[PDB]
Amino acid sequence: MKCRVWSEARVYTNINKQRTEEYWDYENTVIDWSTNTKDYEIENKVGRGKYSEVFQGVKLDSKVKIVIKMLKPVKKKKIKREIKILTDLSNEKVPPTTLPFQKDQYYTNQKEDVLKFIRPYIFDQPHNGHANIIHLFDIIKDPISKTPALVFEYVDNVDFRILYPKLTDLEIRFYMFELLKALDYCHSMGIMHRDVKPHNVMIDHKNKKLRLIDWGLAEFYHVNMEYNVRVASRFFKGPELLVDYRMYDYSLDLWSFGTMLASMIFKREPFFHGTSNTDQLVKIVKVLGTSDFEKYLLKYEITLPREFYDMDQYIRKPWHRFINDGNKHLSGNDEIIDLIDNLLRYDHQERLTAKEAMGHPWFAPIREQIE
Template sequence: MPPPTASSKARVYTDVNTQKSREYWDYDAHVPSWSNQDNYQLVRKLGRGKYSEVFEAINVSNNEKVVVKILKPVKKKKIKREIKILENLRGGTNIIRLVDTVKDPVSRTPALVFECINNTDFKTNACSAVLSRLLQALDHCHSMGIMHRDVKPHNVMIDHQMRK
């Protein structure tokens, strides 16, 4: 099979974004709504990456466990794009749910609040089921005109109790 050229075209979901309104794909024009970060109490650090630090937290209004991803300084455009993508994918198959977006009132540091997944490492015999669900999630993203671009084990969360 010859290598793809610059003019190659996807075989599936080719025209997804052309069928959506400008509001769907125009990240620059998106205006996120920011809630009060005091609604969440950080409990413990779960991890960190190049662009963020991730914490287990509690929603103080309903005592629900959540995960807060505090974003490191990046261009506003990148933050708006991530928020818009998460909003567009909300409710999709095997897609983590964005619960809220908050900003520190003093530092203006943005953070994303997600549902809490009881994530645990998985054994080799569970890989088939996990891979199947991961592919379903990626198919959903692609069907919505979104390419993930950072698929790696660290970005896959598995709740073995809920089997999702």
């Protein structure tokens, strides 16, 4: 037990007490691999990452386009985990987020100090966030090569560095709302994504379609579990990961979301541009400031890792400092600044939840168009 002060999710705290081993015990699953690779014709390469090479293909049966994620070698339990998470998310008959909202089943952390973080706004309607999770269609393993592969639905994506600069204010609102729906759903299912970033969000702009992909670092949330902090990707890592506060939760994803948002709105990519793991924290504290950083360390009685003792003292950078004529069409309103400010907080408990964020004034033009 690394952590000194313990922490629990503010919301969806007890999903994996409600659900049992058959849902979350991925280690003790048996993967029924399809031997028949002849069902799929692999065509061009569509991307790559730390854990795979990804190709677009065709299911010969139906001629439907698919993608095939050819998995690099990793521990077998990591493959079981990705598959179990994907199947849990796609196979849920009645997604919790489509049911009527129950405040008292939602805000489940009843510590007096955590309840002061409940926002006076919240998105309290059913929504289709489950439809923004990528669908896993098949799991294949060549009998010769023995390469495991995941077959997904295909999304017609453009690199974020090409697409995002083209997006209007309203379009950013739209897509980031879609992403929040996806996160509200997976969190409602007791799952943390743990790698929210642009390359893990596929957008087919002509079909106004968004899919949250790459569930290979996702985990099930268990109360007071200490997780590995070497997850997510550098620029999107929350302060909890960097200071080795292991008892984190779904709120990690909201920091990552917030960093994506700040980059889009302020047109600084990435927003927190660490040149190393150590420097990632420096880049964050250079904005949010040493004062609130210290208060956060004190709140959780965090022993700061050794590497961070060469950090200088930094005064907070007000968000308005990042506004300029190149981005004022996106950044020049009080709503977006308040939204970003309420996502990017050292203390993971202080951060907006996905539902709270969805209820924020900035998304009003999007919510107005729902009905």
